[PDB]
């Protein structure tokens, strides 16, 4: 643990500084160090962790897609052989991406999930587990592809089951979980109808519960509801 000698509070402070400086790799390393202190994470700390790794893996995914597109065009009919380099570099980025996913899943399994008893923490971490298995699934091609997909599905389903029993339909964690599980159905599981049904039902149940909210909670919930509607517009 390269961060083992730094105070937990100092790691959290430096994660916040790294965020302001748009140094997301640093932010992720700081938050990994904080997790490895072994204490549970507060709500703010959980979101620092997720923001950091989402930005890191997001850049990797964007790069992988560029390289995968180039590689597919280099293997088309009539294309000129450019050598192993495109595949090699796509593989390099892919391996680094898988490594980030393995790291995040590792933090969740040792030992964030098993200590998370409140719905807002447990649903948050199970959503993250689904998300990072989904990123593995985006690049998976071999014997374990179906098991990787099912690992994502299983995590998202447990998170959904808890969220429906323990959170109001406008809870932003519940909403973001449903948004992302819907995308899993559409893009990973080849289940566009399930994706569309989930997005619609989530939006409608949230709409019916907005009346209970303060102005600030309303803003948080309607922001994610607009993303559900954006996806529905893309898909219908």
């Amino acid at each position: 643990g390269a961060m083992g000698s730094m105070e937990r509070a100092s790691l959290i402070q430096k994660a916040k500084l790294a965020e302001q400086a748009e140094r997301y790799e640093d932010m992720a390393a700081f938050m990994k160090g904080a997790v490895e202190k072994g204490e549970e994470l507060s709500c703010e700390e959980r979101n620092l962790l997720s923001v950091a790794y989402k930005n890191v893996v997001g850049g990797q995914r964007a790069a992988w897609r560029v390289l995968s597109s180039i590689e597919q065009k280099s293997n088309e009919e009539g294309s000129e052989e450019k050598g192993p380099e495109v595949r090699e570099y796509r593989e390099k980025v892919e391996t680094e991406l898988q490594g980030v996913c393995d790291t995040v899943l590792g933090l969740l399994d040792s030992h964030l999930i098993k200590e998370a008893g409140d719905a807002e923490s447990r649903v948050f971490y199970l959503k993250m587990k689904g998300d990072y298995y989904r990123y593995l699934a985006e690049v998976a091609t071999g014997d374990d592809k179906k098991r990787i997909i099912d690992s994502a599905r299983s995590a998202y389903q447990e998170a959904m089951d808890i969220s429906k029993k323990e959170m109001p339909p406008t809870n932003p964690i519940r909403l973001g979980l449903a948004l992302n599980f819907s995308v899993f159905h559409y893009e990973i599981a080849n289940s566009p109808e399930e994706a569309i049904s989930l997005a619609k039902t989530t939006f409608d149940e949230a709409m019916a519960d907005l009346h209970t909210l303060s102005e600030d909670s309303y803003k948080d919930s309607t922001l994610i509801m607009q993303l559900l509607r954006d996806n529905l517009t893309l898909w219908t």
Binding site: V183, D230, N231, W235
Partner: peptide, 5 residues
Amino acid sequence: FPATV
């Protein structure tokens, strides 16, 4: 790509 958070 579709929206996720």
